[PDB]
Ligand binder design. Structure first.
Ligand SMILES: *[C@@H]1O[C@H](CO)[C@@H](O)[C@H](O)[C@H]1NC(C)=O
Lengths: 441, 49
């Protein structure tokens, strides 16, 4: 039997319902999400890391001159400094005082740290949404499986065929561009490959961490060597990767809405409490029992003995009953007013049973379904003591949940007073108009 | 669970109350004063004899 419904996209809060099959006693169904994962499709754009400046030995040409040539090296620089007179431990290196030339070379390459300390720039698009579900039905204990939240791929869980519909919202915490550094994800609009600027995040860009083609854009300028010293001085803008690491700011892990948790393998947002999830589960036929084969429950009376509209199961109720065959009986509240903790109870020939529930309503009024029967529970609830709790609420608050009987009385008095007073004016007008008409006639 | 109340300043007369904690059965509480002492601060001015 196929049961179709919509459950909220809340991890850790179970969805409870009764599977009502004509001719068979209702079968209690419970579906709980273990986790929800939004797995976008990612494409690695390039890898950024701190640059290393490689400086080959300068060519010191005594009594002559040399000329620089271009080379296929990232940010390659070459400048010929004429009129050098270098000295070393062995004295004057060259004889000629002026016809003396030093050729300096420098180029940028990936630092050794780039193998471990680097940022990955990813292009992010929409993708698969997956979830893990925990399901029970009838006497069958908990079963779980990983399913695709797409509304097309069925999953076999405990011989039950479950279809999970697409999320009601396409919202995702990742922008079209993300930067993955370590365990953190940043919604950073990184510059495109080949357009990075010196001192900024993209100053050094590589398609892969092992790529032989490196793009480097730093103001690498060769400076004239100091008088008499053989060295290759240079000026360069500080690495933009270190600057970004200082200014990277708050990662998406800390600012993602809806409490999403960000994971990197694969990149995904977990447990985002967004929208609702349509579902469809086919309960095995063997799980259903005929009405005449189940105990019949009658003479139901529900008394709420305690109630607090706390996030936990702060309510307690006692249900008196009479039943035949003294068997087990599913318990469920189809109304959203209160969520019942117990799923089923053991019934005797006569007696009473208790159950716990959580509700936000100051005056709960909900229908409790007892296998083949139903009863209405009413009561009053006190405010909770704890201002702050470390656990999510088990119930859903409604617009009218906070309206007390006193507030309803005042609302009825105000609305009825104004309505009746206006109606009085209208009736008086019609009556006097008719009186004038009969004055003429 | 904190229970707050006002008891009379009487010695030998116990204060009785039920500590009602939401969701738990009430716990009987009995507070009795054995003695009360007002101990002012004193400065010896002088000794006469
Ligand atoms: C399903 O819920 C039951 C509750 O007793 C728990 O023992 C089980 O571990 C849950 N399933 C998963 C996959 O965590």
């Amino acid at each position: 039997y196929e049961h179709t419904a919509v459950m909220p996209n809340k991890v850790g809060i179970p969805y409870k319902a009764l599977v009502e099959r004509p001719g068979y006693a209702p079968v209690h169904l419970q579906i709980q999400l273990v986790n929800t994962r939004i797995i976008p499709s990612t494409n690695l754009e390039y890898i950024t890391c701190k640059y290393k400046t490689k400086v080959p030995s300068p060519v010191v040409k005594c009594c002559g001159a040399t000329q620089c040539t271009s080379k296929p090296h990232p940010d390659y620089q070459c400048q010929v400094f004429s009129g050098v007179y270098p000295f070393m431990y062995g004295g004057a290196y060259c004889f000629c005082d002026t016809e003396n030339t030093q050729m300096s070379e420098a180029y940028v390459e990936r630092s050794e740290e780039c193998s471990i300390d680097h940022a990955k720039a990813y292009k992010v698009h929409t993708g698969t949404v997956q979830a893990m579900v925990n399901i029970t039905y009838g006497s069958v204990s908990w079963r779980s499986a990983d399913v695709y939240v797409n509304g097309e791929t069925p999953a076999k869980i405990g011989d039950a065929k479950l279809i999970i519909g697409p999320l009601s919202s396409a919202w995702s915490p990742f922008d079209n561009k993300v930067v993955v550094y370590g365990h953190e994800v940043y919604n950073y609009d990184f510059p495109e490959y080949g357009t990075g600027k010196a001192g900024s995040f993209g100053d050094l860009q590589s398609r892969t961490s092992t790529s032989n083609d490196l793009y480097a854009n730093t103001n690498l300028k060769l400076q004239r060597p100091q008088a008499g010293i053989v060295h290759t001085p240079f000026t360069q803008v500080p690495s933009g990767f270190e600057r970004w690491k200082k200014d990277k700011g708050a990662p998406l892990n800390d600012v993602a809405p809806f409490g999403c948790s960000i994971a990197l393998e694969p990149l995904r947002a977990e447990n985002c409490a967004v929208g609702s999830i349509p579902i469809s589960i086919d309960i095995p036929d063997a799980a259903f029992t005929r009405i005449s084969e189940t105990p019949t429950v009658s003479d139901l009376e529900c008394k709420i003995t305690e109630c607090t509209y706390a996030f936990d199961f702060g309510g307690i109720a006692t249900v008196a009953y009479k039943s035949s065959k003294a068997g087990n009986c599913p318990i469920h509240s189809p109304s959203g007013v209160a969520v019942i903790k117990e799923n089923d109870v053991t019934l005797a020939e006569s007696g009473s049973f208790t159950f716990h529930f959580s509700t936000a309503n100051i005056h709960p009024a909900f229908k409790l379904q007892v296998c083949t029967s139903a009863v209405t529970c009413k009561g009053d609830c006190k405010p909770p003591k704890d201002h702050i709790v470390d656990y999510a609420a088990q119930h859903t608050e409604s617009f009218t949940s906070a309206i007390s009987a006193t507030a309803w009385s005042w609302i009825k008095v105000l609305v009825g007073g104004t309505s009746a007073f206006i109606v009085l004016g209208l009736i008086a007008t019609a009556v006097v108009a008719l009186v004038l008409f009969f004055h003429r006639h």
